[PDB]
Amino acid sequence: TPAITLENPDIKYPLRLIDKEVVNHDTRRFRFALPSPEHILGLPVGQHIYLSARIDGNLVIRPYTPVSSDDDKGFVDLVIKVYFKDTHPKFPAGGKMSQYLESMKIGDTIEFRGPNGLLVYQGKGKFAIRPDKKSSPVIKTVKSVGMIAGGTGITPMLQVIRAIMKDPDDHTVCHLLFANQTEKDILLRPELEELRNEHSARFKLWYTVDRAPEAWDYSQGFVNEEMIRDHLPPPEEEPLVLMCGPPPMIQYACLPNLERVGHPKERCFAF
Ligand SMILES: Cc1cc2nc3c(=O)[nH]c(=O)nc-3n(C[C@H](O)[C@H](O)[C@H](O)COP(=O)(O)OP(=O)(O)OC[C@H]3O[C@@H](n4cnc5c(N)ncnc54)[C@H](O)[C@@H]3O)c2cc1C
Numbered sequence: 001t002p003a004i005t006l007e008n009p010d011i012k013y014p015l016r017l018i019d020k021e022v023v024n025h026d027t028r029r030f031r032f033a034l035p036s037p038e039h040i041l042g043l044p045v046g047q048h049i050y051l052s053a054r055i056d057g058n059l060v061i062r063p064y065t066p067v068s069s070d071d072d073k074g075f076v077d078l079v080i081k082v083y084f085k086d087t088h089p090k091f092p093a094g095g096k097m098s099q100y101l102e103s104m105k106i107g108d109t110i111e112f113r114g115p116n117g118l119l120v121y122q123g124k125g126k127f128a129i130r131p132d133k134k135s136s137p138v139i140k141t142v143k144s145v146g147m148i149a150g151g152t153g154i155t156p157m158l159q160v161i162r163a164i165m166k167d168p169d170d171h172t173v174c175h176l177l178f179a180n181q182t183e184k185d186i187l188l189r190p191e192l193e194e195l196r197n198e199h200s201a202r203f204k205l206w207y208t209v210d211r212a213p214e215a216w217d218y219s220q221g222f223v224n225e226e227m228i229r230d231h232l233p234p235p236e237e238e239p240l241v242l243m244c245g246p247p248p249m250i251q252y253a254c255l256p257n258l259e260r261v262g263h264p265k266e267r268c269f270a271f
Helices: 096-103 151-166 189-198 225-231 247-261
Strands: 013-022 027-033 048-055 058-064 075-081 109-116 119-123 126-129 138-141 144-150 173-180 203-209 240-244 268-270
Touching (some): 027 096, 048 096, 058 096, 075 096, 119 151, 151 173, 151 189, 151 240, 189 203, 203 225, 225 247, 240 247, 247 268
Parallel strands (some): 144 240
Antiparallel strands (some): 013 109, 027 075, 048 058, 119 126, 126 138
16 A cells, blocks of 8 residues: 555645646645655545644644545645735735745645544545544444535535545435635536536535626525525434534524524534
C-alpha cells in the first residue's frame, strides 16, 4: 500500500504548490505535490486538514477538505474561495489565509497537518462520530444522509458523496441541498451534475441561490422549511443530516428548520 503523508496530526508537513487554476470569479484550485509521486495524503473520509502560516505577523490556521482523495497519488487539490480585500465593506481587509494562498507562487510551500475531525465515514452507511474530542466515537449506520452545504461548505460533502458512489456495494442515498449566493457561485457544479447523471439512485441534488436567474428550475432564497422537507430524506427514515456553511446559515436557516421538519439534534452534525 502507498506511503502516507499525514502520519501524525501533531506534525507539520510543508508541501509545494505545483499548479493553480481559476474555478470562478473568486475561487481557485490549488494543487500541491505530496512528498513523492507515489504518496497519498492519508485522509479518512469525513476528516479535513489544516493549513498554517505566519501571515503579517500573526499565526493563522484554517481547515480545508481537499477535492482530491487517497486514490490520487503524488498530489493534493484544494478548491479555495479567496476573500479579497477592498471588496466587502464589512470586511475591508479580506481573508487572511485565502489571500495568502492566492499570493503564492508556483514552488512556494505551506504547512499541512491532519487528519482532523470528529466524524469519519467508514463506508456502507457507517459513520463513526465522536461527541467531542475527549469521547469515544458513536457508530451510526444509516440508509440515507441529508447534506446541507453553503458555498465552500460543499467540500466536506463532496468528499463523502464521492466515497459512497465509488463503492457499488454502498447503498447509502445522499440528498444534497447546496446553497449559494448566485448561479455563478455554484462551486463544482459540473462534478456534482456528473455524479447525479451517473448515480441518480444514490444521489439527489438540489440547489438554492440567494438571487436567482430568469431561467431557474431550482430554489431561491436562504435554506427554508420547504427545501428541507422536499430535498432531504424524511425524519422517519432517521437519516444523518450533515451541514457545512456560514455560521448564520447553520444557526438561523438550518437548525430551526430541521427542527420544524422533525430531524432531532442527535441526527445532526455540523462540520
Ligand atoms: C471542515 C471545513 C472544510 C473547509 N473546506 C474549505 C475549502 O475546501 N475551501 C475553502 O475555500 N474554504 C474551506 N473552509 C473554510 C476555511 O477554513 C476558511 O474559513 C476560509 O478559507 C477563510 O479563511 P481566511 O483566513 O481566508 O479568512 P478570514 O481571515 O478568517 O476571514 C474571513 C471571514 O470573514 C468574512 N470575509 C472576509 N473577507 C470577505 C469578503 N471579501 N467577502 C465576504 N466575506 C468576507 C467571511 O465570513 C470569511 O469567512 C472549510 C472550513 C471547514 C470548517
